[PDB]
Design a protein around this ligand. Structure first.
Ligand SMILES: Nc1ncnc2c1ncn2[C@@H]1O[C@H](COP(=O)(O)OP(=O)(O)O)[C@@H](O)[C@H]1O
Ligand SMILES: Nc1ncnc2c1ncn2[C@@H]1O[C@H](COP(=O)(O)OP(=O)(O)O)[C@@H](O)[C@H]1O
Ligand SMILES: Nc1ncnc2c1ncn2[C@@H]1O[C@H](COP(=O)(O)OP(=O)(O)O)[C@@H](O)[C@H]1O
Ligand SMILES: Nc1ncnc2c1ncn2[C@@H]1O[C@H](COP(=O)(O)OP(=O)(O)O)[C@@H](O)[C@H]1O
Ligand SMILES: Nc1ncnc2c1ncn2[C@@H]1O[C@H](COP(=O)(O)OP(=O)(O)O)[C@@H](O)[C@H]1O
Lengths: 353, 353, 353, 353, 353
């Protein structure tokens, strides 16, 4: 039926279902479905429920203006949410970037903080580090988010969607990180471990966790890690855990012009001088020294980063070339028993494919 | 010294002081000075003080999204504030209006609500009606106003102005109306005065006040007056007062295309059938039937409306021509003992100068 | 003679001499005259002489591509020269910057490295620190500088200027820093002073010099100071000196978005914990805590920065506002006997005029 | 399978391999492969090797700025290299040429010197003259070539390509001519042969070689042949050879507006008055008087000239029409025993197809 | 007071009165004042009066769509009115004409019919022919004129101008010709004078009038004169008069490309063969053969033609150059006793100044 009526009708059968698919693409996303992580999805529903019951997320007070504590219906904090459009450069949406170079000193893509934040968690899972609290790209609407004058007015009138859904403020895409309880700024503890040293067993545990922090921040080439930016939880009577929490400024697209800019602040710690353990070597080497893993990782990141209205395939290859070079350095340092300090001293490399 | 060095230096003496004047024009305005109404200025300082002490204005809950209850340092409400840029059409700032007609059905200027609001009070004062609570154009900055992502971030860092003023969020221009206490929606009372009629003396007082409402709304050709939009205060053991409160949609630039659109809802009330009193006649006629008063009024409005970044001298003349025609009708109705109802039935007139 | 022939001829007398002045503006500059520093001028002539005798400046081998060792006619190094147009972003000359924001994460002006470099020396002199080797804006032409294909060809033919000057390659504007002899990377010594501590008197001298480094880098808010970027000279049988040498990335126009970015690497040294001395206090406070000095400094920088084809008065005020805030912090820390470490911990401030 | 899944997968099998082909087109070229001339390829590898070992090509001192002596790893000169982008008009790359006429006096294409240079050698081979030293289009990267500021900086960081190739400065396309040893400027010898005449046998040999020069320069309508521009090698105890070396200004697209412009300087020599030999007639006539040879030649040149980013099919036909007219004149002169002098006196002809 | 306050106030005294003058320029014109012809003005008032009393001008039925019979308040016809904007090419008002040639076959200016019509009458008066009924440029508003949808709607609402004038439909500029009574198409009579010849005295009178028609049409180079286009009035018991009535297609800006195009249809009449009389010679020669008269005429036309929004000084000089050439021919023919027929046979001349 290459030129038949039967086929002409088959082609319209596809044309109308493909046009319906594209109409229902925004609502499908905003449904926040995670077949792969039912546990994360449940948290999101708790967040949605709380909002219907008018227990809203609240701005983090001394934080940057664009991040909120998501609460459950009981008032407990359950997540940190950071909307894309409330990021520093969350304006200038009409891609202007291609007119700009057809630059520059800046080495991060303009408005993809939430993606960096989500990418970190992704890298974490694939590497099995379990230090970044599960964070994913989520849509949420709430009175307390920063909307424009028009959005706020346009949302007064009663609106229904047609399965008769009420519509309020538009949902915001953002990163949604599981909230972890009882941690403090890493430096608070590290200086306390300077007066009281820890028992050796606990200290061995701290270092094991620290190595995972180092691996994560190095592969994603985090741009903004201080010693207040990662967290340690220690309860005396005896576990110690680190959480990597603020990962919105990673995945750069080139190494910084100056090597002095954007240091990894954990490199000045004494912990950084301790050679990589055997444990970290056989958790990480079987992975990063296999092209298929790195291929698979790169495809995963591609999937995640595609989401963005401003995604640029050119930029993405630059991002992956940087990360490839980081993986390469890490492999060597892992093989030759180097320490985190030696690792950060290796010269930046780019690997083009 | 027509071409001398003495004059050349005199000319630079003016050129640098004129350039300083223009640099300091925004800070001068944002200082909110009212030599003419020291009482109003004091209220504003109370509002500024409360904000420094972190008692912020709060959104009016069931109102439109862009209006706030300004509180004093004790928590009492002292004003209603409505920022220009939080009005419905408070975007599209780059005047695009001239490219648009070089249209249309719309009969109000795009983003001058606060000016209408302030103009009402101005007309009120000049006419000596005392029904609009004193409202003026004021600048205010506060955490609870709707700022953009960038403004909120840009304001984290410590900024000083050089007399070392701290700088937080940018001040917003808006209308600042004195808050009046113990009124209810006009219809709440009017229907209660339908079961209980009032004692005749009080009723005479209500009508006297009502006539002033009618005069005000007619001269400014209010577009949006319901019987919930004006307020009556009545305390039994015996005064009755009206307040005209929501005047953001007045001063149109042409009469509505249809006469049925935008009625004055008070015209359906029985009160509207009562002929104008003598009292209102000799309060209003000595004024509006004298070209100098109307000239002086027009100059005052010009002064106030100039303030706006988008002010258009063309539009302004259209606004004044409408108001001139309203004044003209009002004069006749005032002379011939017509009622508010007859007045609103007269045909719309425009008076071009 | 306000409309006379005498004046008409006087006006043409000015019009032709003003047009000659503008023709001869480039040649006047390229003459490299320094009435204020005859000693510096002499060095420049030695540099010019060496070039005529075909002893050329040579690229600094492991340095960035745009810097040269200027040699005298005997082959000794006498200066470091860094051409404007060989800086990283030394292309994109047609100011495009105003079309770009009418952005961004970048906090340095695009192509003014040589100006930062010269500004450092300027600040140094005015403050009387004597740690930056005298560096100024100089023009030089040489075979070994990076010219374009056209410049190189266009310069084959014999060209004379009319006082019959030969013309070769076009002179390049750049920064010209006096070369200092016998220093090493600051970290080379600092780690040697970790094994051998110094005699206390010498150590007191090191610290005195260090404080001057701290003052300089803080006021110009250097963006790129490591502990390899400044130099210490120590000859045992007993003086010790610091030189501040690589100052091309200073004078930013806003504080960095993240406080973690661009640290002052000397803040992690133990020397940084030592409270400011009395000596530094009465060298620096009588100066920076007097508005006229700061006014005079700001005018000097204005003079220097004007030179640039891309100078922007808007950017310049941003640069001065940052530096004003740095001065302000420094003053406090100087008054309250704080250390360099405490100083760098103070929050970034901007001071707008 | 005209609309099958099998074919849809076959079509994607081609679409991805065609997209890979286009990605790997630049690296394929820069690999400098010459299956047809293994001997030339070997020289190129020697050149590449020398560069890795840091024995760089060096600018020809009294030559034009864009030509280099390529050295082998032992320091012997092995080639002359002339980069495209270092030619006089090697800027203005964004084809502007079509906007210019939709002109002019100029009769050479803008930036195809290296192509003229390579085309000469091509014509030489096909004609079997063996006077142009084998020259081809080659890519080379080297510190000593004229790169831009950005290229030089961008190349500091370590870059790998993925078969893990290091990347330094970008390779430059250019012409790569085999270096020939022991020749002098043709005029040096010709004036020496004016005092000492040569033995008749050697002189017969010189003339035989000269005729080949004449044939070559005439068919490619060289624009820039002096008597210093071609070379003679003569070693007394007895061979004599000519080399045609500087062929970057040939293959014009129209005859010069004036016949007096661009002469062939060898036409004023006495040698030019000697009638064409029989030897040259039966080497050249069986070739140029056969449409298939001329068709085949034209296709070869097309192949070579296509390479260029700025190739224009319009210009190319103009180039071939000129050369066709030259071939036509040459044929006549060859048939009628004319001399080089008579040949150059014939009127310029164009032959359009 | 060359730079005094007295003069600064004098300059504002002029600036405000000059701005008032320009505001009141349209209303001044639309007042239709004719101090020079009080008799014509009176007719216009009768026309205005009739319109107020709702006796409207009516479209001329078999005429072109843009002409009306103006009636007095009694219903008698008193004028013919032809609005500018109801002419054939009365659209395309935004001068596009200059973009068009920076053409063409067309030899009349685009939209100046009413001006031609008024110019004819002007030429008539100055020449003292008295055959064109007094026609001038007049403004009139009426329901029966062709207005646009918007004008018709915009005029429903009551509008006043401030001396409280009512405003209805906008006045139209047009030509206003006095209506003459009892004429017929010239050909109706001419063919009747072919059967009945006239008494010789009357015939002498006809010819005298005819000569004046010829003079008029020739000097203005009428483009559209048939023998139905001019009128003869003859009442038997004995005067005969001609009226020249339809003069909207005159004053061309170049002679027609073909001499056969646009003939003067009266040239085929036998009357045209009669030599010019003495009477016409001493009425017309003392005038047109004197440069001052022709200068004065040209200035008058300039005055009249300036009125038009689309007036072009370039076109006007072309119009005058044609008319100068016509005057020149006419003079000769007048001097040498030629007839109208010989006159029209003379070759077209242009006279440039
Ligand atoms: N997943 C998390 N669980 C618990 N606490 C968190 C988490 N993420 C952030 N926080 C805490 O809340 C604050 C959030 O700030 P951060 O994540 O740095 O973003 P921002 O600086 O943009 O506000 C931090 O001070 C940190 O102590
Ligand atoms: N000056 C005032 N004094 C006291 N109450 C006021 C005043 N202005 C408004 N209100 C009350 O607060 C609410 C403010 O809403 P309104 O002024 O209509 O603006 P919006 O509808 O934009 O919120 C009204 O419901 C009214 O009852
Ligand atoms: N004024 C100076 N006197 C002596 N040595 C210098 C001077 N300036 C720089 N140097 C030395 O030469 C090198 C120049 O590099 P630097 O000034 O950092 O610029 P870049 O990094 O752009 O080459 C440094 O390694 C430093 O050791
Ligand atoms: N293939 C070659 N073999 C040997 N010497 C050459 C060759 N090509 C050029 N030369 C010599 O080196 C110089 C190169 O200059 P030339 O080829 O004319 O180009 P340019 O004039 O652009 O430098 C010439 O003076 C010539 O003597
Ligand atoms: N001034 C006038 N007096 C009397 N009748 C006139 C006058 N002008 C025109 N007419 C008559 O009315 C008609 C008007 O048409 P005309 O003037 O030719 O313009 P159009 O052809 O554009 O309608 C003519 O047929 C003519 O007979």
């Amino acid at each position: 039926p290459l030129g038949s009526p039967e086929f002409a009708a088959q082609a319209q059968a596809l044309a109308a279902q493909a046009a319906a698919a594209a109409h229902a693409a925004q609502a499908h996303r905003e449904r926040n479905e995670f077949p792969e992580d039912p546990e994360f999805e449940a948290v999101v529903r708790q967040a949605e429920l709380a909002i219907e019951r008018c227990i809203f997320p609240e701005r983090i007070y001394q934080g940057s203006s664009g991040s909120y504590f998501v609460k459950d219906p009981q008032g407990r904090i359950i997540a940190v949410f950071k909307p894309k459009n409330e990021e520093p450069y969350g304006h200038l949406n009409p891609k202007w970037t291609k007119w700009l170079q057809k630059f520059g000193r800046d080495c991060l893509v303009l408005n993809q903080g939430y993606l960096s934040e989500a990418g970190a968690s992704l890298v974490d899972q694939k590497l099995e580090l379990n230090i970044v609290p599960r964070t994913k790209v989520v849509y949420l609407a709430s009175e307390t988010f920063n909307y424009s004058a028009i959005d706020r007015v346009k949302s007064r009138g009663k609106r229904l969607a047609l399965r008769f859904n009420r519509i309020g403020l538009p949902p915001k895409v953002g990163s949604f990180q599981l909230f972890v309880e009882g941690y403090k700024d890493a430096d608070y503890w590290l200086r306390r471990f300077e007066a009281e040293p820890l028992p050796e067993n606990t200290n061995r545990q701290l270092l094991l966790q620290f190595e995972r922090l180092v691996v994560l921040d190095y592969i994603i080439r985090n741009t903004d890690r201080g010693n207040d930016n990662w967290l340690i939880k220690y309860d005396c009577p005896p576990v110690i855990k680190v959480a990597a929490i603020d990962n919105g400024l990673a995945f750069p697209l080139k190494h910084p012009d100056s090597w002095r800019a954007y240091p990894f602040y954990w490199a000045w710690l004494p912990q950084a001088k301790v050679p990589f353990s055997q444990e970290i070597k056989d958790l990480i080497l079987p992975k990063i020294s296999d092209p298929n893993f790195v291929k698979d990782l790169e495809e995963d990141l591609y999937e995640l980063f595609k989401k963005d209205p401003g995604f640029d395939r050119g930029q993405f290859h630059k991002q992956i070339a940087v990360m490839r070079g980081q993986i390469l350095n890490l492999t060597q340092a892992l093989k030759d028993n180097k320490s985190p300090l030696h690792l950060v001293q290796m010269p930046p490399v780019i690997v083009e494919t």
